[PDB]
Amino acid sequence: AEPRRGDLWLVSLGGKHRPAVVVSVDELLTGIDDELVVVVPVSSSRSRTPLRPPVAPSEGVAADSVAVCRGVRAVARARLVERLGALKPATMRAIENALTLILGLP
Amino acid sequence: AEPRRGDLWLVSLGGKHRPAVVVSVDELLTGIDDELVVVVPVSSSRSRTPLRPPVAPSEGVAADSVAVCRGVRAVARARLVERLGALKPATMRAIENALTLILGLP
Amino acid sequence: EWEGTVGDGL
């Protein structure tokens, strides 16, 4: 499939929609529509915190949006309905740090 | 009484119920119903792989099962309706390794 | 299966 780690995609949540960051690795993609992609939803209604780092409009979203890494979820690839953009590498590092904390990884 | 990291819980899927491993850290829980807990679904129907490490009945499932780490999802705490058991430390390390791979972390 | 959880906390 076409969504790549670090991409901003619009996700259809069944109808509501939210931007989200693709966080699963590209080698998992086999090109079937029902295979799972792991994403971090983006919110424009919550304040920034160390676990909700900001995402810049340069990266494809609205002003004052944050990556809600505590809301990390696998979704079917078919739910990713529009490519919106891509994150700056430092934003991706802030998200990776938040996910490492949230999931108790080394 | 509250879900703890490493616990196997029964999760209400809105209605079927299925086990899942709590993988988010205990320090995130504030004790409200609508907070998000990150869980890894456990299936007794999928084959074991390096990203689906096995889970034994001693750990709370009724039959030999696997943790579907690619299906990692944050869900509302209210969906966690019953504690089923707790994983061995080695099972949790295999799950942490799978999640480290899936999410491209250090 | 787990699809109904896709909208939790959002």
Phi/psi class of residue B104: alpha, beta or left (left: φ > 0; alpha: ψ in -120 to 50)?
left
Q: Enumerate the residues of chain B whose CB falls inside 8 A of the CB of residue C2.
A: 13, 18, 41, 71, 73
**Domain extent at residue B39:** 1-106
CA–CA distance, A74 with A90 (Å, rounded to integer): 23
- Experimental method of this PDB entry: X-ray
Helical ranges in chain B per DSSP H: 89-102
Cβ contact C5:B79 at 8 Å: yes
Instruction: Convert B50-79 into a string of H (helix), E (strand) and C (coil).
Output: CCECEECHHHCCCCCEEECHHHCEEEEHHH
Q: DSSP of A74-103, one letter per residue?
A: EEEGGGEEEEEEE--HHHHHHHHHHHHHHT
The interface residues of chain C toward chain A in range 1-10, judged by CB-CB distance below 8 A, are 3, 5-10
At residue A59, the 3 state secondary structure works out as helix
CA torsion A47→A106→B18→B77, rounded to 10°? -30
The count of structural domains within chain B is 1
* Resolution as reported, in Å: 2.2
How remote is the C-alpha of B103 from its chain's centroid? 16
Nearest partner of B86 among B51, B53, B64, B61, judged by Cα: B61
* Cβ-nearest to C4 among B13, B34, B35: B13
The C-alpha angle with vertex A28 and arms to B92 and A60, in degrees rounded to 5, equals 105
